[PDB]
């Protein structure tokens, strides 16, 4: 086997074959006839080798187009497979870039594309008559002559079409596969001639694929390049045959952008969307363009995961591109299996390592290879990645174009209301044993104190592991357990129609009672005024607790691990950073990221419980199938003293995802941080970190990344408010910041500083940067309204209603203007009604999604009444 793997490594397209077709190829390299079989398996493109009993006189696609080389391959009887294989692959890229300069210098020379046609092939016709086009576009640019070539092209195009009709079947495929391309052409320019000026036809020329040519290259094969919207793309001169064309429209030049705005921060490309969209279609139509043969990866369709492993390594190799077609359609073992390698060779191309490991094997990787994975709806919605790969890939929305009886029956319904809550939500449960030994804190009308204490001591153990909803759920409900059984029927039917009005059940006024005002008609007040915040509140006030932070459990509580789940707007790290600052302890970060930082994160684990130092695990979830297998018998059981005297382990985990295992979940504490920084606040916390890096572009640039964080800070302020703003909750990550601060730079660092491409730069993030997740047309909306307000200003913008932010001046400093950014954030206040008056919808959805909140809140604690 390890000369099959040898020979694996002399010529890498054999990790396609697999171990049955290359030991045939190994053996019958003297009759040299059999291999040509083999050849659309590890090619993609071509067919069969075309011989002359003497040498290699060229090769066929599958499609029947003969193609010639321009080096015959000699045989003899003493070669191998390897050699001529070898000698075939650089032949057959040289003859390819032979023709295509032929074309060019033949094009270039007056000639007739009818004539050019049958004699070459046609992807050099196609480069060519594009680099043609474009180049005679960008002079058109400047002398708006756009009428002049309209006509040329149009001419051309009725040139083809009457050639079409009188052609044979073999070259028909080529003239409608020129006249596709000749369409979009003459799409473009009719769409650059209706432009008013020359700003509206270079924010159209940005989006369109720009094919140009390096003179003083002398490295031929490096010639040709590809510039959209400024990123640039080597064009790989592979051959592709006659491939079936798209029709190009507006979305597919759209889905193109975000591939090369992926690829130029070498980020792998995924976009998901229901089937029959054309997803797969669109990334072989993006490998066509740049001359490359994308090799599709066929999920859940009777493949065992040996040959994927053997496909990804060959991939890695040979540096071409892969498609996951349909990767949702996958069995857990496999789908966690392939996305570690997927993430072991994304991590390889970000960071540049020249050898990775996969499959325990030791192997290069070469630069330019690239996975793109599409994703076929779900069924609970739109399928989604795992959570290994969220950090790695930009997702984009691809679519068409007696005393202890009393105190007994009060505990089985403060039980039972708590596993009702251990019921709805998989992180919120409680075992009994945690109850009996919070019931034992309570000693350090003996009855009616014992009872009134025990309910303080519930609210205050049991209130950390919940959120703010089921926090005022259980306050409720634990304040009507009390005063329903201690106080009159009159109290309960008065709280009842109260808490009906706060629901939509039954509204009814009734008296509030004789003389009970000073007890009541507090909560009625806060009706008839319509405000749930304070009423909602006021049962929380009536337990007269301090409500226990986060520092107060664990210093009071006796154990070593700690769950703190929450939601993706907000991390628990800060919190600890104070918090062990406080208690002068120590802080790890053991990222939870590969292979080698599972290893680095058991090793860490298994001395600093020895030496007695906290340590944090950041997103347990996304490797929760190591967890299972050995973290979960790690700090299952409890061993001794050593530990619990030194050692406490925090574990950062996130509301919505994937399950944590039970009893694992059990075992440890619950915590849940739901701190929700203002606005303002998160504006200082965005700017506060760019100058830990410095900036190095220009004075430009720093107000360009003012903006960037204010725009930030304004789109995650309008994600929390789910019912009124965004349609569905969207998750926005400092990943959006980094590629909008990237395209900020790119845009500045190649144009005057005139005030114009606030024309281009506005629509690239609402559409690209932004817009990438978002699938409903009216939240993209939205955002367009948004950055279309946060972007565009002439000297003066107001992008809150207190605060104006004005132009950089010219005396260009900017450590000056660093500090005049600070000063203009220090002068703000942040009014009461920020929420409603930063952000342009009016106060009364504030009040109608406060209304929302308030009856989900009343409608689940009568629900969780009338049951016991």
């Given at each position: 086997?390890?000369?099959?793997?040898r020979?694996?490594?002399?010529?890498?397209?054999?990790?396609?074959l697999?171990?049955?077709?290359l030991?045939?190829?190994?053996?019958?390299?003297?009759?040299?006839?059999?291999?040509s079989?083999?050849?659309?398996?590890?090619?993609?493109?071509i067919?069969?080798?075309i011989?002359?009993?003497?040498?290699?006189?060229?090769?066929?696609?599958?499609?029947?187009?003969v193609?010639?080389?321009?080096?015959?391959?000699?045989?003899?009887?003493?070669?191998?497979?390897?050699?001529?294989?070898?000698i075939?692959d650089?032949?057959?890229?040289?003859?390819?870039?032979?023709?295509?300069?032929?074309?060019?210098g033949?094009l270039?020379?007056?000639?007739?594309?009818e004539?050019?046609?049958?004699?070459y092939?046609?992807?050099a016709?196609?480069?060519?008559?594009?680099?043609?086009?474009?180049?005679?576009?960008?002079?058109?640019?400047?002398?708006?002559?756009?009428?002049k070539?309209?006509?040329?092209?149009?001419?051309?195009?009725?040139?083809?079409?009457?050639k079409?009709?009188?052609?044979?079947?073999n070259?028909?495929?080529?003239?409608?596969?020129l006249?596709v391309?000749?369409?979009?052409?003459?799409?473009?320019?009719g769409?650059?001639?209706?432009?008013?000026?020359?700003e509206?036809?270079?924010?159209?020329?940005?989006?369109?694929?720009?094919?140009?040519?390096k003179?003083?290259?002398?490295?031929?094969?490096?010639?040709?390049?590809?510039?959209?919207?400024?990123?640039?793309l080597?064009?790989?001169?592979?051959?592709?045959?006659?491939?079936?064309?798209?029709i190009?429209?507006?979305?597919?030049?759209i889905?193109?952008?975000?591939?090369?705005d992926?690829?130029?921060?070498?980020?792998?490309?995924?976009?998901?969307?229901?089937?029959?969209?054309?997803?797969?279609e669109?990334?072989?139509?993006?490998?066509?363009?740049?001359?490359?043969?994308?090799v599709?990866?066929?999920?859940?369709?009777?493949?065992?995961?040996?040959v994927?492993?053997?496909?990804?390594?060959?991939?890695?190799?040979?540096?071409?591109?892969?498609?996951?077609?349909?990767?949702?359609?996958?069995?857990?073992?496999v789908?966690?299996?392939?996305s570690a390698?997927?993430?072991?060779?994304?991590?390889?191309?970000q960071?540049?390592?020249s050898?990775?490991?996969?499959?325990?094997?030791?192997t290069?990787?070469?630069?330019?290879?690239?996975?793109?994975?599409?994703?076929?709806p779900?069924?609970?919605?739109?399928?989604?990645?795992?959570?290994?790969?969220?950090?790695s890939?930009?997702?984009?929305?691809?679519?068409?174009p007696?005393?202890?009886?009393?105190?007994?029956?009060?505990?089985?319904?403060?039980?039972?209301?708590?596993?009702?809550?251990?019921?709805?939500?998989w992180?919120?449960?409680?075992?009994?044993?945690?109850?009996?030994?919070?019931?034992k804190?309570?000693?350090?009308?003996?009855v009616?104190?014992?009872?009134?204490?025990?309910?303080?001591?519930?609210?205050?153990?049991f209130?950390?592991?919940?959120?703010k909803?089921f926090?005022?759920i259980?306050?409720?409900?634990?304040?009507?357990?009390?005063?329903?059984?201690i106080?009159?029927?009159?109290?309960?039917?008065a709280?009842?129609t109260?808490?009906?009005?706060l629901?939509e059940?039954?509204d009814?006024?009734?008296?509030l009672?004789?003389?009970?005002?000073?007890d009541?008609?507090?909560?009625?007040?806060?009706?008839?005024?319509?405000?749930?915040?304070?009423?909602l509140?006021?049962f929380?006030?009536?337990?007269?607790?301090?409500?226990?932070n986060?520092?107060?459990?664990?210093?009071?509580?006796?154990?070593?691990?700690?769950?703190?789940?929450?939601?993706?707007?907000?991390?628990?790290?800060?919190?600890?950073?104070?918090?062990?600052?406080?208690?002068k302890?120590?802080?790890?970060?053991?990222?939870l990221?590969?292979?080698?930082?599972?290893?680095?994160?058991?090793?860490?684990?298994?001395k600093?419980?020895?030496?007695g130092?906290?340590?944090l695990?950041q997103?347990?979830?996304m490797?929760?199938?190591?967890?299972?297998?050995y973290?979960?018998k790690?700090?299952?059981?409890?061993?001794?003293?050593?530990e619990?005297?030194?050692?406490?382990?925090?574990?950062?985990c996130?509301l919505?995802?994937?399950?944590?295992p039970?009893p694992?979940?059990?075992?440890?504490?619950?915590?849940?941080?739901?701190?929700?920084?203002?606005?303002?606040?998160?504006?200082?916390?965005?700017?506060g970190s760019?100058?830990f890096?410095?900036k190095?572009?220009?004075?430009?640039?720093?107000?360009?990344?003012?903006?960037?964080?204010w725009?930030?800070?304004?789109?995650?302020?309008?994600?929390?408010?789910?019912?009124?703003?965004?349609?569905?909750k969207?998750?926005?990550?400092?990943?959006?910041?980094?590629?909008?601060?990237v395209?900020?730079e790119?845009?500045?660092?190649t144009?005057?500083?005139?005030?114009?491409?606030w024309?281009?730069?506005?629509?690239?993030?609402?559409?690209?940067?932004?817009?990438?997740?978002?699938?409903?047309?009216?939240?993209?909306?939205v955002?367009?309204?948004?950055?279309?307000?946060?972007?565009?200003?002439?000297?003066n913008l107001?992008?809150?209603?207190?605060?104006?932010?004005?132009?950089?001046?010219?005396?260009?400093?900017?450590?000056?203007?660093?500090?005049?950014?600070?000063?203009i954030?220090?002068?703000?206040i942040?009014?009461?009604?920020?929420?409603?008056?930063?952000?342009?919808?009016?106060?009364?959805?504030?009040l109608?999604?406060?209304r929302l909140?308030?009856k989900?809140?009343?409608?689940?604690?009568?629900?969780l009444?009338?049951?016991m």
């Open positions: 086997s390890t000369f099959l793997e020979q694996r490594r002399q010529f890498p397209r054999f990790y396609f697999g171990n049955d077709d030991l045939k190829i190994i053996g019958s390299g003297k009759h040299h006839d059999q291999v079989k083999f050849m659309k398996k590890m090619f993609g493109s067919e069969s080798i011989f002359l009993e003497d040498f290699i006189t060229g090769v066929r696609s599958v499609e029947g187009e193609l010639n080389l321009n080096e015959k391959i000699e045989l003899k009887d003493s070669i191998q497979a390897q050699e001529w294989l070898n075939l650089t032949e057959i890229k040289l003859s390819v870039f032979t023709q295509f300069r032929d074309c060019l033949q270039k020379d007056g000639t007739d594309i004539v050019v046609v049958s004699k092939i046609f992807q016709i196609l480069l060519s008559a594009q680099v043609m086009w474009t180049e005679l576009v960008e002079k058109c640019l400047q002398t708006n002559q756009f009428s070539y309209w006509k040329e092209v149009d001419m051309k195009i009725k040139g083809l079409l009457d079409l009709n009188k052609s044979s079947d070259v028909k495929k080529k003239i409608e596969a006249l391309e000749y369409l979009h052409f003459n799409n473009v320019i769409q650059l001639k209706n432009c008013s000026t020359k509206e036809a270079r924010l159209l020329w940005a989006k369109v694929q720009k094919f140009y040519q003179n003083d290259t002398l490295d031929d094969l490096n010639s040709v390049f590809i510039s959209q919207s400024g990123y640039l080597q064009y790989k001169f592979e051959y592709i045959g006659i491939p079936e064309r798209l190009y429209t507006p979305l597919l030049l889905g193109f952008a975000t591939l090369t992926s690829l130029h921060q070498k980020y792998g490309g995924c976009f998901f969307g229901p089937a029959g969209t054309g997803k797969t669109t990334v072989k139509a993006f490998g066509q363009n740049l001359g490359r043969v994308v599709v990866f066929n999920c859940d369709d009777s493949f065992d995961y040996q994927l492993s053997r496909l990804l390594v060959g991939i890695t190799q040979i540096g071409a591109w892969g498609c996951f077609d349909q990767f949702n359609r996958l069995d857990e073992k789908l966690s299996a392939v390698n997927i993430q072991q060779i994304q991590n390889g191309l960071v540049g390592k050898h990775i490991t996969l499959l325990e094997e030791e290069p990787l070469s630069p330019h290879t690239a996975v793109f994975i599409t994703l076929n779900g069924y609970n919605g739109r399928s989604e990645l795992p959570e290994n790969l969220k950090k890939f930009r997702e984009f929305s691809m679519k068409s007696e005393e202890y009886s009393i105190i007994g029956k009060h505990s089985v319904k403060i039980f039972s209301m708590l596993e009702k809550f251990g019921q709805f939500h992180f919120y449960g409680i075992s009994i044993g945690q109850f009996l030994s919070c019931f804190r309570v000693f350090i009308t003996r009616d104190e014992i009872l009134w204490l025990l309910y303080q001591e519930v609210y205050c153990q209130s950390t592991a919940l959120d909803k926090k005022m259980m306050a409720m409900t634990m304040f009507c357990l009390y005063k329903f059984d106080e009159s029927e009159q109290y309960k039917e709280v009842l109260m808490i009906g009005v629901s059940s039954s009814g006024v009734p008296k009672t004789v003389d009970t005002n000073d009541l008609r507090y909560l009625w007040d806060y009706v008839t005024t319509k405000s749930y915040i304070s009423a509140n006021w929380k006030n009536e337990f007269f607790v301090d409500e226990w986060i520092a107060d459990v664990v210093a009071n509580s006796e154990n070593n691990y700690f769950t703190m789940a929450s939601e993706r707007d907000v991390d628990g790290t800060f919190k600890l950073i104070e918090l062990a600052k406080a208690s302890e120590s802080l790890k970060i053991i990222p990221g590969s292979i080698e930082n599972l290893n680095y994160a058991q090793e860490e684990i298994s600093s419980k020895i030496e130092g906290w340590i695990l997103n347990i979830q490797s929760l199938s190591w967890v299972k297998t973290l979960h790690h700090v299952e059981e409890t061993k001794a003293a050593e619990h005297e030194k050692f406490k382990m925090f574990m950062t996130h919505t995802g994937d399950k944590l039970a694992l979940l059990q075992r440890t504490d619950r915590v849940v941080y739901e701190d929700i920084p203002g606005i303002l606040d998160t504006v200082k916390d965005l700017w760019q100058f890096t410095g190095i572009s220009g004075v430009w640039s720093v107000y360009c990344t003012f903006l960037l964080s725009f930030h800070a304004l789109i995650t302020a309008r994600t929390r408010l789910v019912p009124h703003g965004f349609s569905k969207y998750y926005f990550n400092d990943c959006d910041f980094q590629f909008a601060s395209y900020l790119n845009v500045l660092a144009n005057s500083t005139n005030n114009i491409p024309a281009q730069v506005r629509d690239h993030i609402a559409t690209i940067v932004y817009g990438g997740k978002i699938d409903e047309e009216k939240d993209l909306e955002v367009a309204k948004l950055c279309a307000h946060v972007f565009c200003g002439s000297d107001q992008i809150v209603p207190g605060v104006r932010i004005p132009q950089p001046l010219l005396q260009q400093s900017e450590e000056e203007e660093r500090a005049r950014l600070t000063a954030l220090s002068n703000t942040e009014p009461a009604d920020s929420l409603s008056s930063w952000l342009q919808l009016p106060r009364e959805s504030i109608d999604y406060e909140q308030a989900e809140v009343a409608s689940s604690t009568e629900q009444l009338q049951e």
